[PDB]
Design a protein around this ligand. Structure first.
Ligand SMILES: C#CCOC[C@H]1O[C@@H](n2cnc3c(N)ncnc32)[C@H](O)[C@@H]1O
Ligand SMILES: C#CCOC[C@H]1O[C@@H](n2cnc3c(N)ncnc32)[C@H](O)[C@@H]1O
Ligand SMILES: C#CCOC[C@H]1O[C@@H](n2cnc3c(N)ncnc32)[C@H](O)[C@@H]1O
Ligand SMILES: C#CCOC[C@H]1O[C@@H](n2cnc3c(N)ncnc32)[C@H](O)[C@@H]1O
Ligand SMILES: C#CCOC[C@H]1O[C@@H](n2cnc3c(N)ncnc32)[C@H](O)[C@@H]1O
Ligand SMILES: C#CCOC[C@H]1O[C@@H](n2cnc3c(N)ncnc32)[C@H](O)[C@@H]1O
Ligand SMILES: C#CCOC[C@H]1O[C@@H](n2cnc3c(N)ncnc32)[C@H](O)[C@@H]1O
Ligand SMILES: C#CCOC[C@H]1O[C@@H](n2cnc3c(N)ncnc32)[C@H](O)[C@@H]1O
Lengths: 258, 258, 258, 258
């Protein structure tokens, strides 16, 4: 089976990568980083996020596995000490999580896939956008910005913004406010909003049309924007699971105690 | 078709009820408040909640309609001025929202259905419970209490507790904290948690076993509790809709401006 | 010097109390629990709160010291192992913290002093009060209740309600909301409010006049209430300090890590 | 008496300015925008903030007045229709509000005065700083940034970040978090913190030393920062008041209803 390994690039992770490669060498396994069917990420969640984006064009052909040699490592299912057990075991059931499609339109159009979230802020200056849900104008948002999160993303930036944590079996996206202004004149919903598949949330500029748009902690300035459009993707990320590690246990281990 | 009308019981609502009855009298419609197939509620959300509980044993045989003569009236789809249009029109498509099943166990067992939410607080004294998700211990909660909300309930008590607003097509329940203690010694997740169908959240007492349990703003003291169990119900509430009034528009009208 | 010791009443605390008494026996110190000048509390913050209320009529004659044999123990300045050092040292500078005066009026009048906070909730049923600041109507509050905190109280219930932590050298009181309803019809400030000395906050009933009123975790049902009035007290609690233990370090130790 | 008028620069504000000048022409009043003793700002809060910074070197010689022709206008005490009454009346008691001193140090040093707040964010990349209160390390902050607010600033950016509203007679500054990360590994206080005069809060970089620093909505990139230091200023802003318009009424009018 074709596979590749990414590494955080520190000494621990590179050696672990070389060892697993040596170990895969004792089985019918081909190292191919062009068309892998298995992608192993060794490092933190940042490393895992990079792996996902490195291969976001072949998501339906790939199953991902994360090994943690980072700090928090929330998409990690394995400690390094378990690495040889993993090479053997891999020589399994697939689990799918929902993703977020962002469409950015100008005056052509670009689309992006997120595993955690997509956010919008201004290119400096006040941020003001009209929020339109399924063609119906919902609110005019004034403030720092907005965050649209996938279910697995809900434990990340979304969480820090007061969003709910959402089991990844729920096909949804969640919109949270960053520092909205609310007074006599200006009004937002305040609460996070959870949208199902097939709902489209569109942000439309009011004055300024330059925005800093992020997808999974890669941030780009987009100029001359006419619309930013959010929807649950039809595409999913697939994980190879070799044992039960339930989402809520993963949440417990990362936030309550481990 | 068999139908009945509940009323908030003020002058406006009683007269409106009598008028619709007179109007139904001109069609093939039988007033039956034992086995209605249509239940019309005239009043606020409190009136609607009472109607739902009056008939919670025949939910699959009934389609509800709310007319607002109350204050906020969030489950209302009609203004009173539109009442004659409604009797005629009713002489339609059905829409279903998810419900919450609460199981309370002692040392037998009682179950309750909620349209908005179920909450737990102590019978006076400190509230401390162990929160167990799918048999796995998740956290020990210290504080004022906990709230488990349906999707349509998310705009109610849940909202005031910092919960996310959740489109009612999502089959889920949402758990929010009321004033949790968080220090060096005590730790909760903080964030709201959204659970899918088939997940079971169980609250288990630590010391005290007396709790004040609410279902939709009816509150009862339960003694000698061993467990409180939450799960998305298999049962649904059915609304008769005669026109499009999308959930997010309903949210916009109630919170942003109407 | 006249002194007394209260104890949490577990074995650890009673023995520690007996030992300090024996130790004070070797100095010019008289045990007097009617007119102590020093009040030593051995236990948690609950024990300390009880000590304060036991002697709230002689606050200007007393200096308090807390020893922690409890759990969190936030008003504690000493670990038990340091107890003999304390008896000797005590054989010192005084530090004063602000207090909250609550006035409850009927149809006579009762006043209460709080070290942590005073809260108001309804006697069951919806809670609705008009909030009047310095005779000017500020808001109509709908929700679970309200909390008025002293500076030292800000790390307690206030904190769980989203209040700010306030250095106790600031002569102020802080009002926080418990689960306020906010929609098209109903509106509260949302934010905590910090009031200086000489500002009076008055809660006035709208319909129901029965309230559950708490002062430092002692809760009483008050009937036929016309007004609840809050103001920074002219009275202060005095601590004996034998070493520097700054408030922010105390906050750090209790919430960040110790 | 020497005076000057700033204007938002729209037609309404310029004409109003010219009219007041004409009106001052009928009294013993000299227009001097180098050494005014009275500074009238005609526009919104942005206009008022600019006026304050235009003259921040002569704050003890000046009394400010705001006229609102803007949108919200929170530092405004007058509607335009009242302008002639103001010129006459001005032909009064002074009110002082506290200010925030920010010190930025490199490897020399710059100081800034704020009327609303000072914030710190990173120059792109993760923001991580050590927060040191009075030389004692309090927390390591990971997240979007931090906001230090004056009392009058508490109704502004601070409010949107969950800060408490603070009566401006309280000599204090308030620190609020922007989107802090909190998990198994990383921990912040969460709550806003209110500091008295003479307390020093120092932010110290961990890795990156480039920060975007704002003072009252003027934002500058500072490079090679060793420390950012916050303290209640010894300087105050003075308002000329011609009538009672209490802070809490000002809050009520701006947030609850006017
Ligand atoms: C800014 C910054 C870095 O902080 C990001 C933190 O969130 C973590 N993280 C990334 N993705 C997720 C995620 N999906 N859930 C929870 N935590 C996450 C990441 O490991 C790191 O601890
Ligand atoms: C680095 C790293 C891990 O991935 C970056 C993740 O950091 C998360 N993040 C970024 N900024 C913040 C933030 N301020 N608080 C919490 N999480 C954050 C966000 O989810 C992003 O995908
Ligand atoms: C306590 C109390 C009364 O306040 C309840 C408020 O919430 C409203 N309410 C009830 N159910 C819902 C609901 N499901 N969504 C939004 N608002 C709701 C009710 O109409 C009233 O305005
Ligand atoms: C009366 C009425 C309408 O229904 C009562 C609803 O009030 C809501 N509720 C009760 N207490 C609060 C509260 N404190 N804040 C907001 N909503 C509340 C809750 O959802 C309950 O079902
Ligand atoms: C309900 C309940 C018991 O929880 C109260 C918690 O708050 C603690 N506590 C009491 N007073 C304060 C206080 N003033 N500051 C911080 N924590 C406090 C008390 O020790 C306990 O940990
Ligand atoms: C027991 C004990 C210590 O003192 C009780 C303190 O508990 C605090 N408290 C009560 N309920 C809560 C609560 N739900 N969350 C946090 N603190 C709370 C409150 O400050 C009260 O004075
Ligand atoms: C970003 C941006 C513009 O929004 C700033 C909003 O806050 C208002 N504002 C400025 N200063 C204050 C202030 N000190 N208090 C309340 N509101 C304020 C300003 O008028 C405007 O409505
Ligand atoms: C423009 C203008 C009025 O002054 C700018 C003020 O906007 C406030 N501000 C900036 N960003 C936000 C924001 N996101 N939310 C609320 N207030 C904000 C902040 O207090 C700043 O001083």
């Amino acid at each position: 089976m074709k596979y590749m390994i990414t590494s955080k690039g520190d000494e621990k992770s590179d050696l672990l990568r070389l060892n697993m490669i040596a170990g895969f060498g004792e089985y019918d396994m081909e190292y191919d980083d062009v068309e892998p069917e298995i992608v192993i990420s060794i490092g933190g969640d940042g490393t895992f996020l990079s792996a996902f984006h490195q291969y976001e064009e072949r998501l339906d052909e790939i199953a991902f596995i994360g090994i943690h040699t980072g700090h928090l490592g929330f998409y990690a299912d394995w400690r390094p000490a378990e690495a040889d057990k993993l090479v053997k075991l891999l020589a399994y059931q697939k689990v799918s999580y929902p993703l977020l499609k962002t469409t950015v339109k100008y005056g052509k159009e670009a689309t992006y896939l997120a595993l955690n979230e997509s956010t919008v802020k201004s290119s400096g200056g006040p941020f003001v956008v009209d929020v339109v849900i399924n063609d119906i104008h919902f609110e005019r948002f004034r403030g720092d910005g907005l965050c649209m999160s996938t279910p697995s993303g809900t434990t990340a930036y979304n969480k820090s913004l007061g969003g709910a944590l959402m089991h990844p079996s729920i096909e949804a996206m969640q919109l949270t406010e960053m520092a909205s202004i609310n007074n006599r004149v200006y009004r937002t919903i305040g609460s996070p909003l959870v949208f199902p598949k097939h709902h489209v949330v569109s942000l439309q500029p009011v004055n300024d049309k330059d925005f800093q748009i992020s997808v999974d902690h890669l941030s780009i300035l987009h100029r001359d924007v006419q619309e930013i459009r959010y929807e649950v993707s039809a595409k999913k990320i697939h994980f190879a699971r070799f044992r039960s590690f339930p989402f809520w246990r993963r949440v417990h281990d990362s936030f309550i105690e481990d």
